Design a protein around this ligand. Sequence first.
Ligand SMILES: CN(CCC(=O)O)[N+](C)(C)C
Ligand SMILES: CN(CCC(=O)O)[N+](C)(C)C
Ligand SMILES: O=C(O)CNC(=O)C(=O)O
Ligand SMILES: O=C(O)CNC(=O)C(=O)O
Ligand SMILES: NCCCCCCN
Ligand SMILES: NCCCCCCN
Ligand SMILES: [Zn+2]
Ligand SMILES: [Zn+2]
Ligand SMILES: [Zn+2]
Ligand SMILES: [Zn+2]
Lengths: 385, 385
Amino acid sequence: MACTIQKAEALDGAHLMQILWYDEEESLYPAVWLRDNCPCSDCYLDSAKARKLLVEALDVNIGIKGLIFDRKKVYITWPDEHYSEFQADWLKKRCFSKQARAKLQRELFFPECQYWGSELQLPTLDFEDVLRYDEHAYKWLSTLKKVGIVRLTGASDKPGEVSKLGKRMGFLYLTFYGHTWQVQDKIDANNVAYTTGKLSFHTDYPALHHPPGVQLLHCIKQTVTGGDSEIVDGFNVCQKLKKNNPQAFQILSSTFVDFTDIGVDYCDFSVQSKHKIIELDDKGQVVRINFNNATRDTIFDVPVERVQPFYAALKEFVDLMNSKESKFTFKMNPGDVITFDNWRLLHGRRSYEAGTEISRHLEGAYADWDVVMSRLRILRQRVEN
Amino acid sequence: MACTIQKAEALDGAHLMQILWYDEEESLYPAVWLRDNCPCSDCYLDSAKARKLLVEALDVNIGIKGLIFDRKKVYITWPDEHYSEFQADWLKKRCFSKQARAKLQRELFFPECQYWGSELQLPTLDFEDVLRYDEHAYKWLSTLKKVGIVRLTGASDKPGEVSKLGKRMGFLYLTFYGHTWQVQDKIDANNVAYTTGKLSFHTDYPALHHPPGVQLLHCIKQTVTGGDSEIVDGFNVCQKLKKNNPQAFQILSSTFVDFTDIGVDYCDFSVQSKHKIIELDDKGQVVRINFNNATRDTIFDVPVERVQPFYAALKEFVDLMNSKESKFTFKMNPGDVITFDNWRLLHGRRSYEAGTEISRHLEGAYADWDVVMSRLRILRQRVEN
Ligand SMILES: CN(CCC(=O)O)[N+](C)(C)C
Ligand SMILES: CN(CCC(=O)O)[N+](C)(C)C
Ligand SMILES: O=C(O)CNC(=O)C(=O)O
Ligand SMILES: O=C(O)CNC(=O)C(=O)O
Ligand SMILES: NCCCCCCN
Ligand SMILES: NCCCCCCN
Ligand SMILES: [Zn+2]
Ligand SMILES: [Zn+2]
Ligand SMILES: [Zn+2]
Ligand SMILES: [Zn+2]
């Protein structure tokens, strides 16, 4: 009854097609949108699933010249004698009602998040299962998206595991630190990450205008002298900050902060960016947190009077991150991999002791969220079919 | 006189340091910013050029406890007995006056653009010179940034040339179409690019939330039956659109359009994005154009009443691109490479004739603007020194 056509007709100077479905619901489709989306082989390249029709070919004032229908299809003639057929279910799916558009957006983008604090139960899967089974890899990425982190257990204690995950997704995101990189204490460290020092809460690579969406971190070797991990849900923290300190929230979401990274690794580099620490979409929703205190530049491009208040805002934000209600602490063991949303979570590390041998070794890599969502969409189709 | 200190003192409850320079100009530096940016080995990791100091260590209400100076340095004691030294020239550079901040921003980001229409003189350099000489590679990237395109002549007529350029920059941007990709007519084409059809003006890869910043395109083989290239300066076009049709400008800069790409190439993929076609920064300046008509989805997530007006806006925008005043047409020959800003220009191709042999073959690749600007900054330092 819902995807079956009871009536189709041209309305409103023939600029609109209305469909009455057999459940009695009605849908409206602009004539211009129908012509733009003709699936015939002139207008649409089936092998690419792409529009061939040019904007230049489109009469924005077009109306339907003729229409007939049956229960599964509408058949339209256009004023220039072009002919189009549309399938009922295709049409139903692309209905312009708020409810139908939102439903489809949820299927495309998996928007649901579960916010968390110190009460987090760390979602956990087996590494080899994830590589072997689509049901597991599907659980992995959907949970990555929804919760922001998934731990995988049972990997080897050897380099190369994050690469296997990268291929399972599709491919890893290359940066100046390499395809993969080794988190360990290094002489003449080009990055505070490559020391035994404490890392306070940060996101990786705000020095790039497009920071890595997803981070993978694999414990090869762990130390007993420190080195615990800490995470916090940045979206949860920002919500608490907006409520507790609207003014600190307004400063962090409007102030451009300069980030910098100069050195040599995969390549020689001199990198500069500007970001709002709390990044809002056009509807005011937090979509990304951009913050590493190590790489925040000495250069600070704001008027002198805005400086101290910026710092006071940042301090509030960091205190919230550090609160016992927000943060979750755990310690990785050899064979553990964490995969997390590097746009939403902040992460850190406790200091540990330097020594003559390497007491501690992680391998990390990055992936792009579009690459991950692509794999998530394909996996879902496979597991539901 | 300008970088030499005549007087330094603590003011405003010691929350501010003022410097009188020997030219009689004055600079103010917040106490919090000075402490945050202490260069001592406790606070700052010289090998990484990164801040070690945590936000948690910073008293946002700090004032200077004591200060002395000489002509090249200030020496500060803090209330908790921490001690800092700052160099005059370091301080002068990071002055918070609007003029000093803007000057430094120009050095970091190379913001200048030369807008153009059909009168464009296509900037042109030799390929091997660019690979061999920093003076040339510097001219290449600075002109790429400023004008939005540079043509390189004298490459081979063989695959692998865009890779050489990728390494000269640093590295290429991997996508689902590969590290490099071959633009030629293909059976079961996964993309309208891989046919003999006309490509109207578009940017590449709006199906990604972070489209490629820079595109490289190398003519291996060219056809006499068509296949001319066309470019347009999208920033120039948007400026003309805002003026001629403010309403069309407002619709294209505020409406989220869905892009899609589903298929198999480097990997299997199902990619989805949303973008405003004319993307504005927070000050209302156009920073990116996101538009490929082939990959614009059938799904269109707006209320029914906004549909036809969107199409009318888009049509105006495309007509402007196609105007004889805006567009620049040229034809690539074997050995030519074009490198251009894929955020600013739109590009296209005239149709040509199918046949049994391959009459036409380009190799393309992408690079990220941060990778390109990094190389641009390093090159400048080398060529000026
Ligand atoms: C880039 N990075 C994270 C820290 C940073 O943002 O500088 N590595 C761990 C890869 C060094
Ligand atoms: C992705 N691409 C450009 C066209 C597109 O945006 O789909 N290739 C030329 C690489 C096919
Ligand atoms: O060493 C760790 O536990 C975590 N590392 C990082 O967050 C990093 O290298 O940026
Ligand atoms: O074939 C050409 O001349 C230009 N190609 C493209 O713009 C493309 O492949 O997206
Ligand atoms: N079953 C309806 C077929 C209509 C074809 C019309 C061609 N102009
Ligand atoms: N030339 C000035 C040196 C000042 C050192 C002060 C240490 N507290
Ligand atoms: Zn058609
Ligand atoms: Zn990190
Ligand atoms: Zn110090
Ligand atoms: Zn293209």
